[PDB]
UniProtKB/Swiss-Prot annotation, chain B:
Residue intervals on the Extracellular side: 1-107
GO molecular function, one term: glucagon receptor activity
Main localization (coarse): membrane
GO cellular component, one term: plasma membrane
Subunit structure: May form homodimers and heterodimers with GIPR.
Disulfide bridge partners, by residue number: C20-C45, C36-C78, C59-C100
Family designation: Belongs to the G-protein coupled receptor 2 family.
Positions annotated as glycosylated: N37, N56, N89
Keyword list, A-Z: ADP-ribosylation, Cell membrane, Disulfide bond, G-protein coupled receptor, Glycoprotein, Membrane, Receptor, Signal, Transducer, Transmembrane, Transmembrane helix
GO biological process, one term: cell surface receptor signaling pathway
UniProt function note: G-protein coupled receptor for glucagon-like peptide 1 (GLP-1). Ligand binding triggers activation of a signaling cascade that leads to the activation of adenylyl cyclase and increased intracellular cAMP levels. Plays a role in regulating insulin secretion in response to GLP-1.
Protein name: Glucagon-like peptide 1 receptor
Organism annotation: Homo sapiens (Human)
Name of the gene: GLP1R
Section covered of the full-length record: 27 to 133 of 463
Amino acid sequence: DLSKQLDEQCAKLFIEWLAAGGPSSGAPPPC
Amino acid sequence: GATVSLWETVQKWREYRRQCQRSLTEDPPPATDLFCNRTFDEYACWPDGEPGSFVNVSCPWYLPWASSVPQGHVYRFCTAEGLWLQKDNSSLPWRDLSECEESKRGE
């Protein structure tokens, strides 16, 4: 509910980071 | 249990990169002189493009919500100059990710 709702949130955050360019984006990896 | 989890999503991404970088280096050259070159942009695997056309690939199978977007496609435009399109004031090339995004509550 909180621990299992933060990992689905981290995966959205990870996909968003990948969308921006991943390593090439300049933004640090999410979690 | 309900979430795919950060570990399983990143692990599935690593395998998608692994299969991509395999194809990128073992797939036979097009042998048609002008074409946009194959690439892995961190998100998707792109093949060699045909000039003056739109190139499409399925939504990357590692996506948490991949099940929710199975007829989806991510797009690029390969120019006549054998170059992947890049719009005014940009560095990352033109791409339509639309059919592959999540979308909120309902069903």
